[PDB]
Design a protein around this ligand. Sequence first.
Ligand SMILES: CCCCCCCCCCCCC/C=C/[C@@H](O)[C@@H](N)CO
Lengths: 177, 270, 270, 283, 67, 40, 40
Amino acid sequence: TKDEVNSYLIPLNANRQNEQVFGTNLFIGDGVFKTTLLGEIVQYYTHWSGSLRFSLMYTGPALSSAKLILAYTPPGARGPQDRREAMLGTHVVWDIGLQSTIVMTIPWTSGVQFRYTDPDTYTSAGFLSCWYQTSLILPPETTGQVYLLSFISACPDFKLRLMKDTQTISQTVALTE
Amino acid sequence: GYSDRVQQITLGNSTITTQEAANAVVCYAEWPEYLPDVDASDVNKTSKPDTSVCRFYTLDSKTWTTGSKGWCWKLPDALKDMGVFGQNMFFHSLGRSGYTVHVQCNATKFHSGCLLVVVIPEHQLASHEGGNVSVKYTFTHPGERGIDLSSAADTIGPGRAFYTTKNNEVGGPVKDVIYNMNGTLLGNLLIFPHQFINLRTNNTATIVIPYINSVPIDSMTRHNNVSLMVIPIAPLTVPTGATPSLPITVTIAPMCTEFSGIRSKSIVPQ
Amino acid sequence: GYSDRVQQITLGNSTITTQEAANAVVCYAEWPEYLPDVDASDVNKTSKPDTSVCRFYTLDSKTWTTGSKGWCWKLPDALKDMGVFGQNMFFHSLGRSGYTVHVQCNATKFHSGCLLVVVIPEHQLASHEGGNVSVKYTFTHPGERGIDLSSAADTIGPGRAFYTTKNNEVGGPVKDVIYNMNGTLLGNLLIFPHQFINLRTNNTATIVIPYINSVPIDSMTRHNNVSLMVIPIAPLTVPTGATPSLPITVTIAPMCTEFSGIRSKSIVPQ
Amino acid sequence: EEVIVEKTKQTVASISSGPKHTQKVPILTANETGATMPVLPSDSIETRTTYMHFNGSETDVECFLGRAACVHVTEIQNKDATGIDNHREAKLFNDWKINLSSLVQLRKKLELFTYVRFDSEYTILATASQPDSANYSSNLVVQAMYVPPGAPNPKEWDDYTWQSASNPSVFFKVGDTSRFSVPYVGLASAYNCFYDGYSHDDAETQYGITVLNHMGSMAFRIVNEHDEHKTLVKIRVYHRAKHVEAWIPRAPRALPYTSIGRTNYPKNTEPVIKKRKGDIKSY
Amino acid sequence: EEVIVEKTKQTVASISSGPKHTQKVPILTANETGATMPVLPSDSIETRTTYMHFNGSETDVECFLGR
Amino acid sequence: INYYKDAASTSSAGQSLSMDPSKFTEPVKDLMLKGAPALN
Amino acid sequence: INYYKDAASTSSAGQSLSMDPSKFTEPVKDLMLKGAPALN
Ligand SMILES: CCCCCCCCCCCCC/C=C/[C@@H](O)[C@@H](N)CO
């Protein structure tokens, strides 16, 4: 209901098999991306192109384990409703271990060479989703939820065109001292 | 020895033979080809099935009567349910392709009649209701059966079998032949790649189409690059006693087909 | 720096990551490859879809309990309904392929248990009725769900969830684990390409399978070249308080896939 | 009628051709092939030699689409803003959804092709008038701001959006004119004049070129505050294509248009082909 | 996805990259270091060759604050 | 001569001089010669 | 070409062409190679 640190924490529940962890459409000018650095800078431009870098960092106990499947679904078919549907598109199976972060890439998959930054458009880059490939197994003497942290950034191939004013700032009267 | 009337086309495990051809048109003098690196945008490695999709597919035959007005097919829509090509079309978000269209219609040296076989790039149709109405997906993506213009035409004004799929239902395209379903005149359709099937001369028309688009690759289920039209100009005249009808068959073969952005099957209306 | 525990496999638009691997087995030290001209018989140009079929497909997960006896999948049967691969499988009368199988199962350093992951070429099954009875298609081609041996096993003698698809119905395979469903002993299964998922050591097994057959190419719907088996040797032992179960996931990726003899879809029983 | 000769770098319009009696018959062909044989007059009659003295520069697509054409006429007002709840409906400011399909003259020229790629040169003319009581005419300044898709739309004539920190905008006097270039801004390699495709919003299905035409809007306003009288300001936008490239020629429009983007024609429309006074044999 | 090639002074957006099975895993890292590894699409999927045809002049700080 | 940084600012491009109607008038696969019989 | 005495009078400077994100993306002391394990 309000902005909080919890907004950045993706819950991970123990002992669940095929279920979905999270999901989101890929309108980089809206939704969960609107306030990120990438989303903020992208909103100063009208066109975009290139690949996105999506990272996930595990923050549970060192003695826990899990395998997740991150999926990127190009536009045309709606968001995946089950792991089987997601697994058919671009995906990465992540094994949680000594290296805490997985870096999935959202490859530029488009016919037209540029897309609109505007979220009020018909279609975006597609969908992003995460599923339990195996399941989260917590060690003894540990209980409750663990969390994932998600990151977003642009690859070196990223392009931005046509500068425009952003709809993230406004005022009704000029500010004074 | 050899002539322009006798030709053979072999694609995959299929071969077309003709002894009454009138040469063959290669749209804008450009043969189909794969997308070069220099023009590519999408970074995914494309899939080129080759012989499993680049082969001839024969659609359902049509009946040409004296009251016929014309037929229209949209590509790649017309092949959406055709073998491995159709399957690839639904599993990928992107794809590009060329084609070789072969229209067939034989008769005798006693028959008369003339068909215009034309390929129109970006054939944006007009709505039957007129004004500010848009054509609904179903009618603009008819499938292998195509659109029968004789349902509500321009020339002599008839209503053959239907008015549309069911009947004149909200969202159908205007079926005036003389106006090409888009506000232009039939006689000017010759500016587009075409051939005539003049019964006294030839019995087949062949047109090779390269990928035509303003983007390197595109969505195949939401966009129809070309539209194939078969229109009777000189009406069918059969000899005394004969049946006043003649079958017309269309056979299309995808060429240099590429697919990209593979995920689950596409969700389309209807 | 680098270790045998950390590996990455990238096929098409899919990538597998593992941090607890135990190297990787390449069946008989042979990497998959396309059929050379010198070994070819069928004269048709084959179709090589590449990235649209040579990618990872994840099957439904299984639950490993203390009463589990084992699971069995048949290739290419297990992938018959998987994306573009499955479609190609039904439209062609011939096909050949290699695979890279990846079995997953994580736990904690407090768990115990050991899985044998083995690939058996030409795994001809025995019939439950014994004597002179043959296994019916349905049971020998189970699909992505595979065969659950815990329905009627050898070791401790249980009847987990079923006895077969519905129950002990005429034509089912004998589900004795200790006898490998074929009259041989489990302990000797190690003569075939295999890996162990010893919970204390690793959490994944990876086996790369080349095309193994006495013919250059073959019917994919009537013949299963290899059989993948996952069998618990050392039973699962979970720590105090924990749930007495663990999920097992199988992910398979076709490699160097070729298809030939394209016609309409295949007609198979059930 | 071949194309090259030495004198003055002259191209020949027709060659000297005398009587003929051959088995090579250039005037007979087969139009069913879909080809138009390049038959010249020297193929059917006896001809003399003539020169072109013509390059055909005025029919180049650069010239054909290279002149300014009116693409829009909008209207804004300068009057008391007090009491008004909708500044856009009061015409205190107005926005134009950018497109070249509203006015038919240029639309028909562009639609002769399927794809077009060019840079744009815009000229905006603003003029004023006072239909009601006025003691004098005031000098006014107009602001034209480009609002690309995604940028905040002005809700009031004195909004914060008019700061135009990132949006490009022009300020000029009424009675005067504005001029600027715009490079080719399409997402694709060329603009589409036609589009046989649709889009999905989970609500409505949109078909046609409207799906691709997603340029921004042009917001106009009088910068000055109100005077004792009301001032009507008409704004005319002109477009001129530069560095033109065109692809796939089409059959020209024959029937009147009904709406932007659609190829629809009105029902119960008059015949476009002239009917003869006499019969097919009349002159 | 490297930065330089000969034709037209063209920068490549993505390189041609095929199947992989290695111990070199570019997609695994540790974000706790405070670094963002330059992972490209050719590190996780099979890619074809494409060119940038783009210099990024409109995102230069000169242009960004230059109106 | 040079006072504009963007190419979009320049005036008209000028005539092409390379006008060939062939791709529209004769887009046939087999070469059709004027004088020779259209179809053998 | 030259009609202004102060440099502040001139127009825009133009693109830098020397854009390296390293100081922001990889400001680590020990060299981190892509492909190598992040922490040994
Ligand atoms: C100071 C204000 C700057 C405004 C810059 C934005 C203007 C955008 C100009 C694009 C012109 C539209 C191009 C599309 C042309 C198509 O409509 C035709 N080919 C089809 O009718």
